[PDB]
């Protein structure tokens, strides 16, 4: 499918050049650069750009552009998911897809790409197999390599590749048998000026870290599965049993692993843990105005709200701000007119606020709206949906592994009008 791949930093520079079907001229990137220039923001650069002879499919991520070159008709999401997966792979091997990581591990990433994409078609795609085909760049291993002459490239196709459980390795053992589960929920919410809930839903996802020896068959069940809907499933899950038993039976892959994701139906009112009081005064053509915001707890379920951050994109009339925070930290960027308030956490003895005056451009008119509020927050030991796991069982192995699970809710797409 894919003819070639260019890694481009937001600076406009090309760092990693790949070619599978033929050598593509670097001049093709000028079409992207043009589009980048036309767009007012990297986020608004079209993911699909047609050029005279090539189609450009690209992903913006972590200050990098993954620009692939395709000369024929290929389903856009096929390509997008693939490229996205590649970036995820880089995160797996080097902590994150960053230009620094790439320039410091050029040979390695070059090799990884050669294993993952074969003549434009997906080849090595499953993490755990790839991990065995090419060993991760552990400094301890590199020492051994310099001592013994050992390779990072294996010479035996991982048995799991030809097994009926392709998502995982075979013959892997641990002395510390354990499994960790992490139930993460995100609150997607639109709050209007009055503080009324416009729209809200809950986005959940359950990840896990598997350090269990051999081939344990896990069985995950809930106390209240009726609250789950539109649940995605990783292919390793025996969907049929999910349907007939409502049980997540599967033999999981090693290490870092995303199991399922789900949505909580709108039929249940989504609790909003945070309310905002606010007032921003803009006198038309004034040299200054007023800013007042208060953050407080609402449906916090008796839990602590912490890791709270408020971000606001102010209009061009705003030049600077005279604000005093009650806690955390007030900062303002006059270049991009960005107001950032590190709130921190809420203590009921006194609710946090940020207040003072705004330095405005004299002669410039007041804005027709106040900028919406983007607010982050986290509550530990709390699944806001009320989702609770019933049982975690294991079959096929004999040991009695550490079983642990966490419940946490974080801000999702949480935005407030004003």
């Amino acid at each position: 499918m894919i003819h070639s791949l260019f890694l481009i930093n937001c600076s406009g520079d090309i760092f990693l050049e790949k070619h599978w079907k033929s050598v593509v001229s670097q001049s093709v990137c000028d079409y992207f650069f043009e589009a980048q220039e036309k767009a007012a923001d990297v986020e608004n650069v079209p993911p699909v750009i047609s050029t005279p002879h090539h189609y450009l499919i690209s992903i913006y991520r972590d200050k990098l552009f993954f620009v692939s070159v395709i000369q024929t008709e290929v389903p856009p999401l096929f390509v997008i998911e693939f490229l996205h997966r590649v970036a995820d792979t880089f995160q797996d091997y080097f902590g994150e897809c960053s230009e620094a990581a790439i320039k410091d591990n050029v040979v390695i990433v070059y090799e990884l790409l050669e294993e993952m994409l074969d003549n434009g078609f997906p080849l090595a795609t499953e993490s755990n197999i790839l991990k065995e085909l090419i060993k991760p760049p552990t400094i301890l291993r590199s020492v051994v390599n310099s001592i013994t002459g050992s390779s990072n490239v294996g010479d035996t196709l991982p048995t799991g590749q030809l097994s009926n459980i392709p998502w995982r390795r075979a013959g892997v053992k641990y002395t510390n048998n354990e499994a960790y589960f992490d139930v993460v929920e995100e609150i997607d919410a639109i709050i209007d000026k009055s503080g009324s809930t416009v729209f809200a839903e809950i986005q959940g996802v359950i990840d896990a870290c598997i350090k269990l020896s051999g081939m344990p068959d896990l069985s995950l069940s809930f106390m209240n599965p009726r609250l789950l809907d539109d649940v995605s499933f990783h292919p390793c899950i025996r969907f049929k049993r999910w349907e007939s038993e409502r049980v997540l039976s599967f033999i999981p892959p090693d290490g870092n692993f995303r199991l399922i994701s789900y949505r909580v139906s709108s039929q249940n009112l989504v609790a909003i843990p945070v309310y905002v009081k606010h007032s921003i005064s803009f006198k038309e053509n004034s040299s200054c105005g007023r800013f007042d915001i208060t953050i407080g707890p609402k449906q916090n379920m008796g839990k602590t709200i912490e890791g709270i951050t408020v971000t606001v994109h102010m209009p061009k009339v705003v030049l600077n701000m005279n604000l005093t925070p009650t806690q955390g930290s007030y900062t303002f960027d006059p270049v991009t007119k960005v107001l950032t308030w590190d709130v921190g956490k809420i203590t009921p003895q006194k609710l946090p606020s940020l207040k003072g005056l705004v330095n405005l451009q004299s002669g410039a008119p007041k804005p027709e709206e106040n900028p919406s509020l983007n607010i982050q927050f986290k509550i530990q030991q709390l699944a806001i949906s009320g989702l609770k796991v019933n049982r975690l069982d294991m079959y096929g192995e004999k040991y009695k592994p550490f079983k642990g699970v966490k419940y946490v809710t974080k801000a999702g797409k949480f935005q407030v009008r004003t």
């Binding site: 354990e178 960790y180 589960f181 796991v389 975690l392 550490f402 079983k403 642990g404 699970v405 966490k406 419940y407």
Partner: peptide, 8 residues
């Protein structure tokens, strides 16, 4: 690493 997880 086991700290912080709910026994299950």
């Amino acid at each position: 690493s086991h700290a912080g997880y709910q026994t299950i």
